Design a protein around this ligand. Structure first.
Ligand SMILES: CCO/N=C/c1ccc(OCC[C@@H](C)CCN2CCN(c3ccncc3)C2=O)cc1
Ligand SMILES: CCO/N=C/c1ccc(OCC[C@@H](C)CCN2CCN(c3ccncc3)C2=O)cc1
Ligand SMILES: [Cl-]
Ligand SMILES: [Cl-]
Ligand code: NA
Ligand code: NA
Ligand code: NA
Lengths: 245, 286, 51, 242, 242, 99, 51, 49, 49, 48
């Protein structure tokens, strides 16, 4: 009654028999932009079921020495399904998201993944090691797309901030002996009512193994981690020709 | 009707004092287990003193007012040092243009970066003197040059006519000048972190310096000069202090734990990654 | 009266623009729950948070 | 003119003075605000959130910092062994420095209230065991053995479907408030010591790792407050920021 | 005397400070006012008035400036040709600089609202034709062809007794306000691009000019406002004024 | 040709949503545009040289000597107003002496 | 009271002459029509302005 | 500004002057008091012993 | 020109004339001239007891 | 990543041994005749 759950939206349904509740980021549900906050005057387009449905991105392999991964929203979907198309044809965009990270093992495996949502996840470089080089992250690192990227220094989240404090953000743990997934519902967060789905990532999703994976030789060693996400209340405005970036 | 298909669990409370403690006795039973939790849910423990031990009653009158974000931020702090030397490398022309950026000093920066978005008014105080702290009878002009307005190019530039821009004329011997500044962003709040790019187009390594730059935070230029057609014989140091007031903050984040390297980004010294906490020899000894 | 141009109740002012006003006394409102217990099925304090 | 007399204080600039200053833009109107999730009003809201405690803060970890975020437990051959120990002092150099609570309380001179530490077991489902977590109030050094630690405030934790347990560090002080504890005179404000012992043993069947880890999360309880705002030690500007 | 304490700000002179100053002529009475037509109260009143847009602002026009006040249209032999293009950015260097709206909005840092451009056809009564005027929101460069421009906000204009047509440049922005757009970081505030295409063709019978002109007039709509008063770039004092 | 500006609005040319616009129109009131002190004259009184070394200067009041303020006023044909004059005085190099 | 000698409602003053008073809060009155639609036969928004 | 005139006494520091001074810690709250025996209010209380 | 700063127990003490601590972003500081009248401020009861 | 774009269910093994994939009636015609290679492929239901 708290470990079992079903998420149905659009023409997609997700099930799980070993959940650990669901988190509503900052206690707020996604919602279309009201007339008091809106500023752009054109009537928005709200595709509904064609874009607010679950999308499953590539799977990652959890190894005994994995550092962790991260994805950026809405970057991950800017080129997938009808959502991507609306994101490319419109200047303005806004929406919430239902993030469902999946990972199952056996009652003999062990390990804990911290799944968190960090809004405005700005990355930094190691500054050439010495700190005298003012280098910057490449486009491929700031917006890794659907494939996601790997963290090089998880301890400081590749941004000079302690991973030990990441729990101050909406999050769940996927502790193999307890649950096999994490679910976080994220509302739209920005200083503006709508924004470019191409030039700005509202938040990043981080999956980091704080407690390394471990198992005895002989047990299945391919332990994948899959990410399935669903836009919620997706709105679009400022229609024109398609633009990829 | 021809087509049928076409048809916050958190509230604020006023807590002026710390929670009291109710007296509790011993609990010996099954089914109920307050001590056991499931951190996986993402929730913090709800266990309280009385659930784990026998407590007495404590009428706690401890105030919670000093930790209100308002009292945490409304303390003037250094955000800029503008020097204007008479002889040397820097501007010996008697005028200086400074692009407004409050990320040049650590103390105040680390406090602001505790949050993602912040909206506020500010009180700016200008402490001016000679490099050695002495004071002389010198007349100065401070001018705010908003984005798009012509920046002065010399000590006699027409821009100093300041017919529309706001200017402050004061003597180095007067008390520090002080003025209030409103919330001026085109957006609804300033943001210390902007995970994106300012414009469209390809983002080649040649222009990667664009990453993280949000015009909504660029408030313009602060220009200063000595009032006169002739050069002044005095070196001048201007220390600018900012005091946040009428503040609102959104989305807390992990506090900076690596030294700051640059104003415009979170880059850290890769070869020397400091540990958030000091170390010891064994885990079983203090 | 004055212009309501403050960034954001017991402040002091002598100018026509509200943002010129002092900081005033800070209020003691709080809402820890949105950060400490942002879960759908509000887990109780007696029975186990998972069952 | 009206008779006035300037008093001491005249011309001074107090950085915390809350006065009124002339506005630079008359008639200016700020961009209207819009709703944004996650607003905070008091730092106490953040202090109540659990963050990871670096209990395993060894010198031999520094080059691989991820290992400080969790400490181990494993099959013992001897009984009543000590698993780990650390001070409860939230504003002292040590494990608490990694928590948002520790960092934030370093911006204040004094603090008061009960603390809370939740331990999450990350071993395999097949592993079981009972641990004795104890809190020793000021006065006694690290308890020599379990039979001594057992005399203070403690919780006997049993592994099961509930991955975590909570050790309450009840506010037990002589003074209403404590300043940050350090070696020397200020040790008068020390909160005490936390020690984790093996109540029984970490037992596991064939096929499961004989070593697992525990993550420690800490935060403040509802009766916690801080006062006397000050600058932190945890941030410095060694060089200029270009 | 009454106890007072001078605070920071003392003696300073803020050019925008709205205080009180001693009157030099006590009892003086200004000449009474008399009615005068044309009083204005807010610059917004002037911003709503259409003024000529210099769409044809070429380098080869500078010596004969009158030619910048109108652009041509003429019999085409090819279909879907581009007639003209320009940015919609009202405070940017370019065609808008010639309008009272552009000049006035350069006295403010930020602006918000919908714009409006009315095109008046000044060809002969016998000439006919259909034009496609489009407004492309931020993101896409000047549309390569008509079939691409057609995907944005647009109006298909038909020549007739009604000499003019109005293209509305609806406020479509992410931020409530925009600062003036320039190359670089501030291009984030660009409004977009306006392009004029031949929907059909400029057709004319024997005896009528095969080339005519169009005058473009621009102004702001009712939801337009500006804020953050500043000095303009459009006026300088290179030398002294005798 | 009528001499009138277009009366067409957003909703006439496109499909619009509802927007409750709270944007203020107060800063563009002529009062806030003009009530900002600006330079209108620089009167020098040198000790040695060409100009008045007699210790006194007569200046005929004319505010059209400086561009910034002049261009703003010339936006209108007629103007009626009171004015606040501020006098900033110092030595040519900006120093101050007991004079 | 004071002398009504101001060049032209929520101002401040300490002298007997009104013109010494501050600028005060600016009013937001407007009349665009006299500049944007000064025609005799007020042209509508629906039918063509010429017929 | 309001017309004022500084009078003799200006700038002086009288050690017994009972005026008001700006507070250094806004919003600060002192530790609550607790009952303590032996409070005295007037030196005359001690003189009678 | 002088600067007086209150450094509560636990806050970093300045080690030089240019120490970062003088940024005084949180500690209360007073800036005053030697020619100004004596600076003056009110201090609350700050003991933990 | 392509199949995921259609109607689908993500099944998780546990105490509940089974899961149900609904093949919702999505057709142009109210009825379908049996599908075969050729003209009648017009009535094909789809792929699982
Ligand atoms: C008459 C002259 O007096 N004017 C003084 C003055 C002082 C400050 C002025 O603007 C100050 C803007 C700051 C309150 C906020 C600056 N911000 C906003 C966010 N931001 C920033 C910096 C680096 N990265 C992200 C954001 C900033 O630096 C303008 C005029
Ligand atoms: C005790 C001494 O303080 N008196 C100062 C003072 C300052 C200004 C004074 O008169 C100022 C008149 C201005 C407000 C208007 C001058 N005008 C009116 C219009 N006008 C002008 C100039 C050139 N062409 C057309 C009109 C002007 O130059 C008189 C006394
Ligand atoms: Cl000048
Ligand atoms: Cl300094
Ligand atoms: Na002041
Ligand atoms: Na005055
Ligand atoms: Na005083």
């Amino acid at each position: 009654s708290d470990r079992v759950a079903q998420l149905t939206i659009g023409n997609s349904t997700i099930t799980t028999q070993e959940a650990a509740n669901i988190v509503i980021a900052y206690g707020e549900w996604p919602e279309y932009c009201p007339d008091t906050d809106a500023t752009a005057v054109d009537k928005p387009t709200r595709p509904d079921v064609s874009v607010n449905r679950f999308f499953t991105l590539d799977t990652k392999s959890w190894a005994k020495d994995s550092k962790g991964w991260y994805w950026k929203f809405p970057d991950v979907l800017t080129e997938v399904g009808v959502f991507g198309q609306n994101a490319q044809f419109h200047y303005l965009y806004r929406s919430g998201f239902c993030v469902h990270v999946q990972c199952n093992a056996s009652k003999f495996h062990q390990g804990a993944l911290l799944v968190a949502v960090l809004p405005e996840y700005v990355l930094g470089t190691i500054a050439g090691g010495t700190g005298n080089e003012n280098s910057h992250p490449p486009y491929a690192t700031t917006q890794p797309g659907q494939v996601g990227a790997v963290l090089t220094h998880p301890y400081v989240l590749d941004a000079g901030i302690p991973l030990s404090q990441l729990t101050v953000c909406p999050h769940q743990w996927i502790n193999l002996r307890t649950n096999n997934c994490a679910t976080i519902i994220v509302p739209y967060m920005n200083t503006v009512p709508f924004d470019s789905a191409l030039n700005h990532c509202n938040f990043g999703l981080l999956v980091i193994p704080v407690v390394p994976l471990d198992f005895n030789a002989g047990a299945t060693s391919e332990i994948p981690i899959t990410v399935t996400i669903a836009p919620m209340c997706a709105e679009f405005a400022g229609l024109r020709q398609a633009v990829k970036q | 009707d021809p087509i049928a298909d076409m048809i916050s669990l958190t509230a604020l409370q006023v807590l002026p004092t710390a929670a009291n403690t109710e007296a509790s006795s011993h609990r010996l039973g099954t089914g109920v287990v307050p001590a056991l939790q499931a951190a996986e849910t993402g929730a913090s423990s709800n266990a309280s003193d009385k659930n784990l031990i026998e407590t007495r009653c404590v009428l706690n009158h401890h105030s919670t007012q000093e930790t209100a974000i308002g009292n945490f931020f409304s303390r003037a702090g250094l955000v800029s040092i503008i020097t204007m030397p008479t002889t040397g490398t820097q501007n010996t022309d008697g005028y200086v243009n400074w692009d407004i950026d409050l990320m040049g000093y650590a103390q105040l920066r680390r406090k602001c970066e505790l949050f993602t978005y912040m909206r506020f008014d500010a009180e700016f105080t200008f402490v001016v003197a000679k490099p050695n702290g002495e004071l002389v009878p010198q007349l100065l002009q401070y001018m705010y040059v908003p984005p798009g307005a012509p920046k002065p190019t010399s000590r006699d530039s027409f821009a100093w006519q300041t017919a529309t821009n706001p200017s402050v004329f004061v003597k180095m011997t007067d008390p520090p000048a002080q003025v209030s500044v409103p919330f001026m962003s085109p957006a609804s709040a300033y943001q210390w972190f902007y995970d994106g790019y300012p414009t469209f187009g390809e983002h080649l390594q040649a222009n990667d310096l664009d990453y993280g730059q949000c015009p909504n935070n660029m408030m313009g230029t602060f220009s200063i000069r000595t009032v006169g057609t002739e050069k002044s014989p005095h070196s001048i140091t201007l220390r600018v202090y900012m005091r946040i007031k009428h503040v609102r903050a959104w989305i807390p984040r992990p506090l900076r734990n690596q030294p700051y390297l640059f104003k415009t980004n979170p880059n850290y010294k890769g070869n020397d990654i400091k540990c958030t906490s000091t170390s010891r020899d064994k885990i079983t000894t203090l | 009266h004055e212009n309501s141009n403050s960034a954001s109740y017991t402040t002091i002012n002598y100018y026509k623009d509200a943002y010129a006003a002092s900081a005033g006394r800070q209020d003691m409102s709080q809402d820890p729950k949105k950060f400490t217990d942002p879960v759908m099925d509000v887990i109780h304090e007696m029975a186990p948070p998972l069952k | 003119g009206i008779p006035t007399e300037l008093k001491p204080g005249t011309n001074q600039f107090l950085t915390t003075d809350d006065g009124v200053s002339a506005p630079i833009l008359p008639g200016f109107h700020p961009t209207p605000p819009i709703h944004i999730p996650g607003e905070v009003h008091n730092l106490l809201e953040i202090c109540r959130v659990e963050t990871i405690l670096e209990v395993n803060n060894l010198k031999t970890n520094e080059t691989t910092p991820m290992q400080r975020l969790c400490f181990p437990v494993s099959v013992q051959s001897k009984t009543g062994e000590l698993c780990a120990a650390f001070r409860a002092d939230p504003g002292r150099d040590g494990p608490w420095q990694s928590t948002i609570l520790g960092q934030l309380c370093r911006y204040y001179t004094q603090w008061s209230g009960s603390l809370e530490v939740t331990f999450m077991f990350a071993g395999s489902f097949m592993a079981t065991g009972k641990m004795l977590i104890a809190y020793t109030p000021p006065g006694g050094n690290v308890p020599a053995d379990r039979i001594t630690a057992m005399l203070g405030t403690h919780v006997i934790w049993d592994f099961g479907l509930q991955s975590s347990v909570t050790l309450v560090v009840p506010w037990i002080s002589n003074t209403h408030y404590r300043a940050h504890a350090r070696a020397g005179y200020f040790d008068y404000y020390t909160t005490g010591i936390i020690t984790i012992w093996y109540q029984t043993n970490y037992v596991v069947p064939i096929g499961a790792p004989t070593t697992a880890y525990i993550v420690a999360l800490a935060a403040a309880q509802d009766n916690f407050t801080m006062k006397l705002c000050k600058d932190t030690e945890d941030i410095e500007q060694t060089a200029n920021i270009q």
